[PDB]
Design a protein around this ligand. Structure first.
Ligand SMILES: COC(=O)N[C@H](C(=O)N[C@@H](Cc1ccccc1)[C@@H](O)CN(Cc1ccc(-c2ccccn2)cc1)NC(=O)[C@@H](NC(=O)OC)C(C)(C)C)C(C)(C)C
Lengths: 99, 99
């Protein structure tokens, strides 16, 4: 689909049977999810947002369905005011910016 | 143009005759540039994202050219970790996400 930017580009995601909403974010290197229990091992990672660095948990090889497209990759879990789908998964679903 | 996301979508912008690099950022409501002097009235503003709050200066009705596409709108200036073109200006240049 084509998604305009008049409002926040928020779409429905499905992860582990959890139905959620997430922001498609070209300014995000990584995918960052609100607190949820994900399976398998994790390790800390420090990532930077507008207000500086925060510590998050990094889980690898997590499948996520984004607007009906299958993705699988690294998902970070931590203090965020929104679920954010970053470029690591946007590339997987063939997302581009067009103007 | 069409811009893919395997690297950060960094583009050159022109503002006040000055050339800068900035990130095309669908996850940003606002446009935020590193410290610089811009003309006229400005208002202190607080903005929020991952890592918390940041104090910036708001300048309105500022001409800015993004990849040769003209915009005139609000530019926030402050200690941002990255120069960011947000939706306020992405919409002015007709940007969309496509997949
Ligand atoms: C290399 O670092 C990154 O890629 N950092 C990403 C990041 O923070 N990206 C920022 C832009 C950025 C890039 C590099 C360094 C610092 C910042 C944005 O793409 C996402 N971000 C994170 C974000 C996104 C959405 C929201 C939000 C808030 C209220 C309701 C819904 N969503 C909050 C934070 N947005 C904002 O912080 C914006 N905030 C905003 O639009 O607030 C409404 C600003 C910018 C205008 C301040 C993540 C931590 C998500 C990976």
């Amino acid at each position: 689909p084509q998604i305009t930017l008049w409002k926040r580009p928020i779409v429905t995601i499905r992860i582990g049977g959890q139905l959620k909403e997430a922001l498609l974010d070209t300014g995000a290197d990584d995918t960052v999810l609100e607190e949820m229990n994900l399976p398998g091992k994790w390790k800390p990672k420090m990532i930077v947002g507008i207000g500086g660095f925060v510590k998050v948990r990094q889980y690898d090889q997590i499948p996520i369905e984004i607007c009906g497209h299958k993705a699988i990759g690294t998902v970070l879990v931590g203090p965020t005011p929104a679920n954010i789908i970053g470029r690591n998964l946007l590339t997987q679903i063939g997302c581009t910016l067009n103007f």
